[PDB]
């Protein structure tokens, strides 16, 4: 509720203001104004056109690293059970297993941009 | 023993903030089957009542339950008061 | 004559290996660019206030032409 | 009396970005030997209205090249969510007592990515789209490493709760413990907010403006206000962590002004930091993050997991 | 109403899956399933559970991040494709918004509507539990377990995620 | 100078401090002079429900001590 | 962002300066020296002058 | 009467436009070096409200410092097209007024004003720091001059 108002009274300024500023300034438009931007010489080839990504093999690596947020960000519950002897041997196992992960990436060249 | 600090110093040296890391996790893996203070983290987790003390049934034969709680009986917080 | 500008050695002794483990872990070398900067916010700034003040010229100055009168 | 109490957080907080524009373009001439706005208003004190008033009565274009639904959508996502990264913020007593906030900010903080990956592909300029692709990188830089490092300070206070932070830090700053995480968490936040040196997805000399290439008048005017936004929000949320002030609740001005003095020398080490350092690579950051920081992150969050335990100082769950 | 409040959520949770399942420019599809994953952050968060429905919006940020970084790589083409581009985009499209009206108009009349399952349409609130927990979420401290009482859960999935890292550089490795 | 940049920052400190100023006051101002309720658990929930009933006013910051039992 | 090829195509500040001091007397043609490294304009004349 | 209001309406907007010049950065030869020195500490055009912004979109005024070449030109007018009015292009120096040294040659134009309109001439080869500044702010006082909306209302 609190957070539904709060919620859309940020939106609904942030949409009045995109609304004032299509509609308060004058307008003059013309094909030469609008074409795309590429330092005063006209592109060559669509901006649509594919764009190699270089670092592909540690965007799948974040993936695989951003759920141990999810495993890992319960542990200031965890670490309030009666089995601390086994919570902690099972918190620092899942971390040790995520530095092997980051170890082995990283020594066999995983981390390093393709050329 | 002359090798084994002659490849720490040259990590140190290439490498010094793999060497904290090491030393930091190393640390986290030892201490806690070496500190004394390891088992009080398991009885204050213990002594916190998350739920209701369900009274039992005194059926005449349970000296060491208390009646009330003001009793000598039951565990007690002494240890923690002054921890 | 001449001289070499980035040929040199770092001391391999423990101290100095320490040194440099200090300065990368703590970023010494990166606050000593902190402290020149923050110097600068307290030295007064070189701006003339123009139109009110110009910078100064000399006689030989070379501005627009004009055509003389004995 | 709720639509006021946010009026009485939005309308300040735009009134602040307009005043940082001022003390940044003031800070960073002096510290280049410069004055800085001094001539519009005394001390440049009306140059923020000046600015704000020439680009809402602008022109604003759209590229014909462009997809027009994301290209109006994205200047809204950046302001909005902007905004919203401010209700859960303990000054001392939150808009919105979130029990999650540290997870809500987390989520919103990603969320308003996409205002700058949309606002690039929307687009359909080359610039914008390397400008884009280089907030692709930089948010698998600093994502993975910023929310360890926020599990590893959480481990001492006891929840995701912001205002159970000011409970944790009443007897003593949690910088004292956790300096080695507050340097790394400093250095996120300005990888967060695309803050020199970190600022790539702009990178004026490389990308001439980067994402925001095409966008002009008032829908680059939201771009920006978001922007500088993020960056007291951000130091704000370095203060609570890091600088927690003591609560009086019979005093809760006190607490503002204190804690309000903090988030400032922290917004203007965002300036100091600007005007002396060069930019990285967005590839060196990457490895700086990855090689540097996430090795340490793991290691001082197994070490935070078992030091409470090893002291018996395992904080409360409520 | 705000009774409905999450029969509202599922009606735009469904939508968004109407829009990535009509296949556009993934670009458009992964907007769809950033939708779809806020809503169900939503619902899940309406049933008491918070971490959960915080957890699968933040985790699909991420995923939807890189494929976007992705898409502009490997699945792009001169004109990417809206809604309103493709007779087969657009039918589908049209399709599954009429076929959730449908659901939605005999849910809401009849408040019965039998399609594979018996749907009751009384309100999602008439299911809720009308007693009260004690001093902690029930979702925290379940989830708080998976390292007292799943040990054989972190194990196998401890042991996945390390494979997997191994198992991508493999197949991404050529020549 | 470099205090011709302070100004500014009064602005902007000022604007800073409005936002928790004017929680407090208001959260005071609709409860009753007290801190707002916080609710994080649901126990604490059911109590401030139960307050709202013992009010009679259906207000749950509209406490009723000892002259409420006879 | 990794470079296959550089292509500088420049003459977008080519003014015939070659071709101008040839209209010149060698005084005339001094200042035209001024102008190609305008960042070392004194050691521009330097060299024609001592050609000179 | 109400040409009174507009008029000081127009004085708001007029204020908003000359306060905030926003020069895009573009330089073309000698010229912009001491364009750069307009900028410098000693001048500090930041300190009346100019900002250099690299995007045309993002421009209020372009200052043509240097000389244009044929190959040059079609690019300049480009980036002129692409700026949002109100836009205003300041000439400086005597390559980009008329020519200048190299008004005979093959490859340059003899004036900036043949492809872009201008407002203001600076002259000098090259003008100094003090008087490009001097041209902005005449170009500041003809923007105070504007009475768009006193022509509007009498339409
Ligand atoms: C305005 C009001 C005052 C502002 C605050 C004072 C300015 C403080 C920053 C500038 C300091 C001046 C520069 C300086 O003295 O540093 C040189 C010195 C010299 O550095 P160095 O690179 O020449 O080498 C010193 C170390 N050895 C020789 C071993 C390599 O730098 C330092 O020693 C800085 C050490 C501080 C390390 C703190 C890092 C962690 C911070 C945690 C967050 C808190
Ligand atoms: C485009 C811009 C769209 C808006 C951006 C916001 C996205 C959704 C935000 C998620 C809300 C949230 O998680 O709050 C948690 C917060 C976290 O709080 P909490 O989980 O700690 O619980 C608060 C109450 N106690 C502690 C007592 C249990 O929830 C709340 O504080 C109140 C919940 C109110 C119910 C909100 C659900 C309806 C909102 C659905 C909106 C979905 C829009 C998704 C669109 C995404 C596409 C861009
Ligand atoms: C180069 C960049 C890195 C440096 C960035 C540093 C920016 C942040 C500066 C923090 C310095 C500490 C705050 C000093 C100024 C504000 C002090 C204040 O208002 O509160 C009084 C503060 C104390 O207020 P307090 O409420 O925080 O109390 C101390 C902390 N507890 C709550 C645990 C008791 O006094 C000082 O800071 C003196 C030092
Ligand atoms: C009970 C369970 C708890 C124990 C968990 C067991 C798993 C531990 C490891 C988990 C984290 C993964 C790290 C393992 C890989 C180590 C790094 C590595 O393999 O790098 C290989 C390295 C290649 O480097 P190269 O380019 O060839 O140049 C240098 C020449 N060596 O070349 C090398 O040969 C590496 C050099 C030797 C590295 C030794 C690493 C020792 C790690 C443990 C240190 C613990 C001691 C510190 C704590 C002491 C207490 C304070
Ligand atoms: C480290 C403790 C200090 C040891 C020391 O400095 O004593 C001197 C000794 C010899 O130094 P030197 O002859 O110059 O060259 C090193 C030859 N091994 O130095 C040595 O021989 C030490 C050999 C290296 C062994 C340590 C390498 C691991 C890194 C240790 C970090 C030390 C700094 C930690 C902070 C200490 C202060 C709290
Ligand atoms: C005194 C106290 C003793 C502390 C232990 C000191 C010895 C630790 C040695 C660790 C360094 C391993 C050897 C090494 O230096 O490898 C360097 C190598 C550099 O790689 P790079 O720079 O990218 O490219 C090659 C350019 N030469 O780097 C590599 O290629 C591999 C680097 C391995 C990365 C490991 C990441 C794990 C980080 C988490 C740390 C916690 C590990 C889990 C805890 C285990 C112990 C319980
Ligand atoms: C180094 C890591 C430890 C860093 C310090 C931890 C925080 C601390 O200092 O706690 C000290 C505390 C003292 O007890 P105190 O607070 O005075 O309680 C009485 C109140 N009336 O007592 C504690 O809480 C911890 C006491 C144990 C010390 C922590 C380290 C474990 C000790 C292991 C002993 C085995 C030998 C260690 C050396 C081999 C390991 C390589
Ligand atoms: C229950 C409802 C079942 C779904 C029916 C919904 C109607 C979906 C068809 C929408 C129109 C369409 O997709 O095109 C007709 C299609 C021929 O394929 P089409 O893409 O049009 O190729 C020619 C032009 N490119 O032809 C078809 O594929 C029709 C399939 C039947
Ligand atoms: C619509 C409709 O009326 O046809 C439903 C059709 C026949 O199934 P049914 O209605 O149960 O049999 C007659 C019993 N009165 O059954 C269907 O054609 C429904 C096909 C749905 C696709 C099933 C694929 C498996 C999905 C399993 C999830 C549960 C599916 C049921 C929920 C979907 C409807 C909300
Ligand atoms: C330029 C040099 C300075 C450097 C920058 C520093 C940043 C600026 C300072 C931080 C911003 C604080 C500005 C406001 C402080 C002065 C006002 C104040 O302290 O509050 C007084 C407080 C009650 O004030 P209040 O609640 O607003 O009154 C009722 C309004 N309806 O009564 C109290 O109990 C508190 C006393
Ligand atoms: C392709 C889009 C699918 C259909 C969208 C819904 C409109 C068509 C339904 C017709 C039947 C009807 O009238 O249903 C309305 C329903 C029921 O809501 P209720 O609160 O029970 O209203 C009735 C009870 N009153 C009077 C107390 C309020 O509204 C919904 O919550 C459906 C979703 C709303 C649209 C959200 C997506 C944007
Ligand atoms: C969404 C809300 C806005 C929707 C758009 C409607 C408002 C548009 C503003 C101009 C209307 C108008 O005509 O203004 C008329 C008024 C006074 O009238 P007058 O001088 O007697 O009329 C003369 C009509 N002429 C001009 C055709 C001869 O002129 C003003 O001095 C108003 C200018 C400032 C307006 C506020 C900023
Ligand atoms: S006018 Fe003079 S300074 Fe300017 S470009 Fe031409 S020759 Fe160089």
Same mark, same amino acid.
């Given at each position: 509720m609190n957070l539904m108002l709060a919620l859309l009274t940020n939106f609904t300024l942030a949409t009045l203001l995109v609304i004032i500023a299509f509609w308060l300034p004058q307008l003059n438009v013309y094909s030469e104004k609008t074409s795309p931007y590429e330092c005063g010489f006209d592109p060559m080839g669509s901006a649509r056109l594919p764009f190699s990504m270089k670092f592909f093999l540690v965007a799948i690596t974040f993936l695989l690293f951003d759920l141990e947020i999810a495993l890992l960000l319960p542990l200031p519950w965890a670490s309030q059970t009666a089995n601390l002897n086994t919570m902690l041997t099972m918190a620092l196992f899942l971390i040790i297993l995520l530095a092997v992960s980051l170890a082995y990436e990283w020594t066999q060249k995983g981390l390093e941009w393709t050329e | 023993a002359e090798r084994v600090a002659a490849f720490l110093k040259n990590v140190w040296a290439k490498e010094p903030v793999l060497v904290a890391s090491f030393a930091i996790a190393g640390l986290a893996v030892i201490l806690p089957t070496l500190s004394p203070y390891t088992k009080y983290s398991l009885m204050i987790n213990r002594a916190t009542p998350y739920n209701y003390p369900v009274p039992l049934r005194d059926d005449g034969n349970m000296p060491d339950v208390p009646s009330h709680p003001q009793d000598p009986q039951g565990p007690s917080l002494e240890w923690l008061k002054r921890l | 004559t001449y001289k070499y500008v980035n040929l040199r050695e770092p001391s391999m002794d423990m101290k100095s290996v320490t040194d440099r483990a200090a300065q990368t872990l703590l970023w010494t070398e990166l606050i000593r660019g902190l402290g020149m900067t923050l110097s600068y916010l307290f030295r007064e700034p070189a701006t003339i206030n123009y139109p009110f003040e110009k910078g100064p010229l000399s006689p030989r100055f070379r501005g627009e032409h004009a055509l003389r009168r004995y | 009396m709720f639509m006021i109490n946010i009026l009485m957080l939005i309308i300040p907080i735009l009134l602040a970005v307009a005043f940082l524009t001022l003390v940044e373009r003031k800070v960073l001439g002096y510290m280049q030997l410069r004055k800085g706005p001094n001539v519009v208003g005394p001390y440049g004190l009306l140059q923020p209205i000046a600015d704000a008033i020439k680009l809402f009565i602008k022109e604003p274009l759209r590229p014909a090249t462009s997809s027009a639904s994301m290209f109006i959508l994205a200047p809204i996502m950046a302001l909005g969510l902007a905004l919203t990264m401010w209700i859960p913020l303990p000054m001392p007593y939150p808009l919105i007592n979130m029990n999650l906030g540290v997870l809500f900010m987390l989520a919103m903080s990603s969320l308003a990515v996409y205002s700058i990956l949309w606002s690039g592909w929307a687009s359909n300029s080359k610039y914008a789209l390397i400008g884009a692709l280089r907030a692709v990188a930089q948010t698998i830089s600093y994502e993975v490493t910023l929310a360890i490092i926020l599990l590893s300070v959480l481990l001492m206070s006891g929840s995701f709760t912001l205002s159970t932070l000011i409970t944790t830090q009443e007897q003593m700053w949690l910088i004292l413990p956790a300096w080695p995480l507050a340097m790394m968490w400093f250095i996120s936040t300005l990888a967060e907010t695309n803050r020199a040196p970190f600022d790539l997805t702009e990178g004026e000399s490389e990308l001439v403006s980067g994402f925001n290439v095409e966008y002009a008048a008032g829908p680059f005017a939201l771009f920006f206000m978001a922007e500088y936004a993020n960056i007291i929000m951000m130091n704000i949320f370095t203060a609570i962590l890091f600088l927690g002030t003591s609560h009086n609740p019979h005093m809760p001005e006190l607490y503002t002004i204190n804690f309000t003095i903090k988030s400032l020398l922290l917004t203007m080490s965002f300036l100091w930091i600007r005007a002396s350092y060069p930019r990285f690579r967005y590839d060196q950051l990457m490895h700086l993050l990855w090689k540097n920081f996430l090795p340490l992150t793991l290691a001082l969050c197994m070490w935070h997991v078992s030091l409470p335990i090893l002291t018996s100082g395992i904080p409360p769950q409520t | 109403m705000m009774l409905y409040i999450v029969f509202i959520l599922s009606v735009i949770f469904v939508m968004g899956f109407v829009g990535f399942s009509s296949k556009p420019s993934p670009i458009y599809g992964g907007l769809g399933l950033i939708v779809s994953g806020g809503v169900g952050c939503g619902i899940v968060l309406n049933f008491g559970g918070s971490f959960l429905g915080l957890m699968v919006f933040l985790i699909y940020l991420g995923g939807m991040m890189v494929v976007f970084g992705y898409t502009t790589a490997m699945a792009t083409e001169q004109y990417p494709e809206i809604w309103l581009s493709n007779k087969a985009v657009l039918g589908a499209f049209v399709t599954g918004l009429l076929m959730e009206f449908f659901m939605v108009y005999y849910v809401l009349k009849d408040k019965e509507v039998e399609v594979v399952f018996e749907f009751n349409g009384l309100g999602d609130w008439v299911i809720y539990d009308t007693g009260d927990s004690g001093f902690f979420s029930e979702e925290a401290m379940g989830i708080a377990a998976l390292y007292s009482y799943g040990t054989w859960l972190v194990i196998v999935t401890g042991w996945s995620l390390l494979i997997g890292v191994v198992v991508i550089m493999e197949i991404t490795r050529g020549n | 100078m470099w205090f011709e940049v302070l100004?500014?920052?009064?602005?902007? /400190?000022?604007?800073?401090?409005?936002?928790?100023?004017?929680?407090?006051?208001? $959260? @005071?101002?609709?409860? /009753? /002079?007290? *801190?707002?309720?916080?609710? $994080?658990?649901?126990?604490?929930?059911?109590?401030? *429900? @139960?307050? @709202? @009933?013992?009010? /009679?006013?259906?207000?749950?910051?509209?406490?009723?001590?000892? *002259?409420?039992?006879? | 962002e990794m470079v296959r090829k550089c292509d500088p195509h420049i003459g977008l500040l080519h003014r015939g300066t070659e071709k101008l001091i040839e209209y010149k007397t060698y005084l005339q043609a001094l200042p035209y020296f001024d102008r190609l490294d305008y960042v070392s304009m004194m050691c521009n004349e330097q060299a024609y002058s001592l050609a000179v | 009467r109400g040409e009174y209001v507009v008029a000081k309406l127009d004085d708001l907007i007029n204020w908003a436009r000359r306060s905030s010049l926003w020069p895009m950065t573009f330089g073309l030869a000698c010229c912009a070096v001491e364009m750069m020195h307009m900028a410098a500490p000693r001048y500090d055009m930041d300190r009346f409200g100019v900002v250099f912004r690299a995007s045309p979109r993002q421009s209020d005024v372009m200052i043509v410092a240097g000389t244009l070449t044929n190959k040059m030109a079609p690019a300049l007018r480009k980036v002129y097209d692409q700026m949002p009015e109100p836009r205003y292009v300041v000439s400086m120096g005597s390559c980009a007024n008329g020519g200048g040294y190299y008004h005979y040659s093959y490859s340059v134009v003899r004036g900036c004003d043949r492809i872009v309109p201008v407002d203001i001439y600076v002259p000098g080869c090259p003008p100094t720091a003090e008087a490009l500044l001097y041209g902005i702010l005449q170009l500041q006082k003809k923007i105070k001059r504007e009475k768009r909306l006193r022509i509007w209302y009498r339409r």
């Open positions: - | - | - | - | - | 100004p500014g920052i009064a602005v902007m /400190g000022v604007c800073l401090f409005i936002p928790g100023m004017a929680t407090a006051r208001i $959260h @005071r101002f609709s409860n /009753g /002079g007290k *801190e707002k309720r916080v609710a $994080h658990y649901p126990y604490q929930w059911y109590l401030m *429900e @139960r307050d @709202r @009933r013992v009010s /009679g006013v259906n207000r749950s910051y509209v406490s009723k001590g000892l *002259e409420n039992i006879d | - | -």
